[PDB]
């Protein structure tokens, strides 16, 4: 047992001790680009997810357990305590690293708990909390994760609402939320609360100073180092990555249809979620939800027709954008194509063990690209007004182009250098905009293209245990008035944040419920048009599944 199995050389060493009880590693790849965008673009990409709860726990029980449950989860998920904004010794800002401070005292632990396990004030609903959190950046900048318990809403079910930086997160939020819900019904925690006269006294009974020597192996690594450890890219693989970059750059310059942004940001936006702090809530998440039964039937119907739910949804988005906006980067009368902007998850090439406990990859985005030719998205008979057969053909074309682009993991090879260059250029652009006195919303839009190309990322259903009892997590169905404590989630809500002048569509599923949503700032795009596109897509999905 002296020769460990597997390939883990880089991942075993990325986190280094930089000071007492403090680990640090450099950010590499997409995670570095995200960290810079969150700092310089007001929290761009940050995530809010609400898990709506059925439970027989009172609000008071959930409130008195939340902080200790979070503390317990932190013990095996130190990723919750990472930080991405620091300074060098010359005092200059440092966005290039992630750090982890191992907590040594009860006082320090209690401070982290109170900053991270928030009890939401009476009345506020779950939907209101997702609106609020998605409409601002996480503070203080550098904080990676915060949990909000909505246990006293004036109507509706309670929820666990998580707000996270995207730098080291994504899919992982569901696993983090699941761990918190499981901890909330652990009998040992219930007994601890029952045996203690304050939450700090409960913490004192269990607290152990955190140990960097053993926690390093549980902290997340960049996808880039996991990629190097698994694939050991050689010169030809590196050059293959550059070829995928060149294809993506080319696709971004070819004539494309898309959604036109406003030439200048609206000073009086009418489409808001209310106001907070005297300013309107213009970050919108326009959602279309499809329930368990209909989702199952749609997924089957498209498969039976030789198609797929995600590829047909993409075809409908492309075609609706074309018909509703009639906007393209073609400087002539020529019909445009469509530049496809989308992400893939690294699980397409990496096994499940890459995303577990040992040096996990917690942000597994791999950028995709593709380009639909004008002849593939217009009909010689109908022009833009594609019939059902022509939409199925467009879906097939999209699916084939994505499968071709995503065949190889070596896309990842280009992202370290591109990440460095994009990050450096971001900081330089921000500096130039500050020197120019540019208005912040002008700064967030002036470098965005005039035409936003069709941007859809799809995530298929991944089974997650969503029932929690004192025996642990399980896939069993929601119980009907059991004798034992339980928490169950059958529905989630996503609030995405897109602060630059783009429109991002997301198709995803949780507990069998499918959501198609668009997130964007209504200061840059007409929300009526986006709502019309979403309605068009859902109507066509329903029509073509019934055909």
Numbering used by the authors: -7 to 539
The authors write:
Two types of PtMAC2p crystals (A and B) were obtained using the purified enzyme. In the type A crystal, residues Met1 to Ser539 and residues numbered −7 to 0 (GLVPRGSH), which are from the DNA sequence included in the pET15b vector, were modeled using a 2Fo-Fc map at 1.0 σ. The PEG is bound near His158 in the cleft of PtMAC2p. These residues form a hydrophobic surface in the cleft.
The crystal structure shows that PtMAC2p possesses a large putative catalytic tunnel at the center of the molecule. Interestingly, the HXXXD motif, which is a conserved catalytic motif in the BAHD acyltransferase superfamily, is partially conserved as His158-Thr159-Leu160-Asn161-Gly162 in PtMAC2p, i.e., D in the HXXXD motif is replaced by G in PtMAC2p.
